[PDB]
């Protein structure tokens, strides 16, 4: 059994896969790559570093082991976009974003198509290339013979990586038709990296050789674990257990906390992390049997019949209405906790006030038309009547439409156009009764106000 796997490097968005690369192969078995198994690793998903991972496999008639280190990485710097201390090359210059023939940099797949980098080294053997390394923790590059040389025949070079003088990593000897290869090596704590390309056979004839796509990756200097967990056991809640007052800043906070994962910065995820932790222990759980205060005793009697039942009206009788029908009702108070109000038949009621029913988002049918709101009676003073005819809508706009003033035979004695508040001139009435109409009319709330005052 012959278990291989090689040394991966992934970004923070990309999904790691763990079997990815490994292969197993025996001769008495043939391909055992399904059968492969994790004997040990320290990887944690959401996590940026460099993890450990053991494979093992076993056959028909025996085991075997390898091991490779997969890092999660974060910000990169591309190699040519650096300037190198050092660059030997057997022929040629050493070429950056292009080969050393100054076409674009192209090696070979593993399905024979060619790959076109925008990025890398182009090279030539004998060639060594020293880069300063240092704050860096992963050196990543493709490797292999550039395509310029595909007619060539006899070109072949072999890669070879130096961390501080110490050789790292290696390729076998690539030619022409060899696809191109990975070398993920770990540069952390170093102060140079060597890119060394050997000659192989045949001398240097033709080795154009590229250092594809490489590029130095960072550990991530953030790390979203603690407010992925917070989020996860935020979302678990029910948000109908809490008052909207307090479920609403938890609601915030959970979006603060999602908008903070996609911004990958360090303080905008901590800042978000304590918000979150705040409104967590700030929440507040509703009472479904506390006692409403319904001063209108109509309203009472009202919800007491949609509901069936006597005595106090709670809060999570008020949560279950979707539905209520009033009569004689004047005074709208307590209605604002029926947070799940749908439709709302009030017609013909004494309402001058849809205030209470402002925060109720779920309130798609309400049916307060023809309302009659006996306002009293008005005392004349100083020659003169003055009255409140300010009719609330549930925006808290004033609806009052007309105001006129009408006499014991019905014949209207002045109109007007209405404001907050009217004042009727008394001193040219003749002595008697009379009553002020105060019209309102909006989108389903209509009725009239009505005053008296004698002379
Ligand atoms: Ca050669």
Redesign the pocket.
């Known amino acids: 059994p012959i278990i291989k796997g090689e040394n991966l490097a992934y970004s923070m968005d990309e999904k790691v896969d763990l079997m990815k690369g490994i292969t197993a192969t025996d001769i008495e078995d043939g391909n055992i790559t399904s059968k492969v198994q994790i004997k040990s690793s320290d990887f944690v998903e959401g996590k940026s570093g460099i993890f450990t991972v053991v494979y093992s496999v076993t056959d028909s008639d025996l085991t075997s082991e390898c091991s490779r280190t997969i890092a999660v990485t974060d910000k990169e710097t591309q190699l040519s976009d650096l300037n190198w201390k050092s660059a030997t090359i057997g022929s040629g210059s050493v070429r950056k974003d292009r080969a050393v023939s100054g076409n674009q940099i192209r090696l070979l797949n593993e399905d024979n198509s060619v790959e076109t980098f925008a990025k890398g080294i182009g090279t030539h053997?004998y060639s060594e290339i020293v880069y300063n390394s240092e704050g860096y923790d992963i050196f990543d590059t493709w490797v292999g013979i550039d395509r310029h040389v595909a007619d060539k025949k006899?070109?072949?070079?072999k890669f070879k990586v130096y961390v501080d003088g110490e050789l790292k990593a290696e390729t076998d000897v690539m030619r022409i038709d060899t696809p191109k290869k990975r070398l993920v090596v770990d540069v952390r704590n170093s102060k140079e990296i060597k890119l060394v390309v050997d000659?192989?056979?045949?001398?240097?004839?033709w080795?154009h050789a590229d250092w594809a796509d490489a590029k130095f990756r960072n550990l991530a200097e953030y790390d979203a674990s603690e407010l992925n967990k917070a989020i996860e056991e935020a979302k678990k809640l029910d948000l109908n257990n809490y008052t909207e007052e307090s479920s609403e800043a938890l609601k915030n906070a959970i979006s603060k906390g999602e908008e903070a994962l996609l911004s990958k910065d360090k303080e905008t995820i901590n800042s978000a992390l304590e918000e979150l932790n705040k409104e967590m222990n700030s929440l507040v759980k509703v009472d479904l049997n506390a006692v409403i205060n319904i001063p209108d005793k109509y309203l009472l009697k009202s919800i007491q019949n949609q509901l069936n039942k006597t005595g106090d009206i709670t809060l999570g009788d008020m949560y279950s209405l979707t539905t209520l029908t009033l009569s004689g009702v004047e005074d709208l108070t307590g209605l604002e906790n029926a947070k799940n109000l749908e439709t709302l038949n009030m017609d013909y009621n004494e309402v001058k006030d849809l205030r209470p029913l402002s925060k109720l988002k779920k309130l798609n049918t309400l049916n307060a038309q023809e309302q009659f709101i006996a306002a009293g009676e008005l005392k004349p003073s100083n020659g003169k009547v003055i009255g409140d005819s300010k009719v609330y809508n549930r925006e808290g706009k004033n609806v009052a439409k007309t105001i006129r003033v009408v006499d014991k035979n019905g014949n209207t004695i002045l109109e007007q156009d209405a404001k907050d508040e009217f004042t009727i001139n008394t001193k040219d009435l003749s002595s008697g009764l009379y009553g002020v109409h105060v019209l309102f009319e909006d989108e389903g709330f209509s009725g009239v106000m009505f005053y008296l005052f004698n002379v």
């Open positions: 053997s006899v070109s072949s070079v000659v192989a056979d045949n001398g240097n004839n080795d």
